[PDB]
Amino acid sequence: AGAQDFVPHTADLAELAAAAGECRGCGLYRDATQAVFGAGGRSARIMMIGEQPGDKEDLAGLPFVGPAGRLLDRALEAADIDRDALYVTNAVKHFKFTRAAGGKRRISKTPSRTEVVACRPWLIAEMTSVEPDVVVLLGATAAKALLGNDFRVTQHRGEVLHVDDVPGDPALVATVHPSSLLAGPKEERESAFAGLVDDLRVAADV
Ligand SMILES: O=c1cc[nH]c(=O)[nH]1
Numbered sequence: 101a102g103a104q105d106f107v108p109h110t111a112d113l114a115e116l117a118a119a120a121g122e123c124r125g126c127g128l129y130r131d132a133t134q135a136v137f138g139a140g141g142r143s144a145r146i147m148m149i150g151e152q153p154g155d156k157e158d159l160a161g162l163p164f165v166g167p168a169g170r171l172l173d174r175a176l177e178a179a180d181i182d183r184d185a186l187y188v189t190n191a192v193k194h195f196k197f198t199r200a201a202g203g204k205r206r207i208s209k210t211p212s213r214t215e216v217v218a219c220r221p222w223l224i225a226e227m228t229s230v231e232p233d234v235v236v237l238l239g240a241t242a243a244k245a246l247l248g249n250d251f252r253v254t255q256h257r258g259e260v261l262h263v264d265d266v267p268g269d270p271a272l273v274a275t276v277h278p279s280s281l282l283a284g285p286k287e288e289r290e291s292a293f294a295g296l297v298d299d300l301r302v303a304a305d306v
């Protein structure tokens with residue numbers, strides 16, 4: 101079901117990414133510019149999964165290149181993690197969006213659980229390909245994709261999780277989505293940034 105028949109029998113990331121360009125596993129390929137596959141290499145020990153490409157990513161062809169990605173880079177650097185050593189992807193690989201009159205960007209819309217489950221074959225192929233030691237799940241959509249639709253990121257901060265139906269049984273660490281840290285009162289943003297750095301250090305210490 102979903103994307104499964106579009107996923108080739110290969111662990112080569114370049115070939116998986118090409119095949120995802122042709123996926124019709126849900127409706128999101130229609131209005132998006134292109135599939136945005138994960139970035140990084142199969143030697144990566146840490147895999148990080150966001151929700152979906154946003155406006156900038158949909159046109160760059162790469163994940164986490166916009167304001168959320170810049171905040172994530174600042175957190176990674178503070179956690180002493182090299183972004184180039186990670187494998188970074190998203191639960192959903194085509195941008196789901198709308199525009200508002202007078203808006204300065206295309207606005208992301210939340211993928212339905214249906215779309216997440218349809219796209220998950222790709223995440224499974226990425227995980228099988230990369231064999232990460234730990235998966236960082238950035239925000240609610242990504243965390244629920246592997247931990248269940250009832251899972252609450254806010255209730256499990258700092259925790260190393262392991263679930264039985266995840267390929268290779270990597271450690272899993274669920275944390276706040278970097279987009280959440282972009283706005284809000286300064287003290288709240290600074291406390292939340294420190295907690296993201298903490299969670300990234302937990303994952304890197306696995
Ligand atoms: O790649 C991206 C960029 C922004 N937000 C995400 O969840 N992923």
Ligand code: SF4
Binds near residue numbers: 129
């Ligand atoms: S979002 Fe995922 S399942 Fe849906 S068409 Fe795109 S790659 Fe396929």
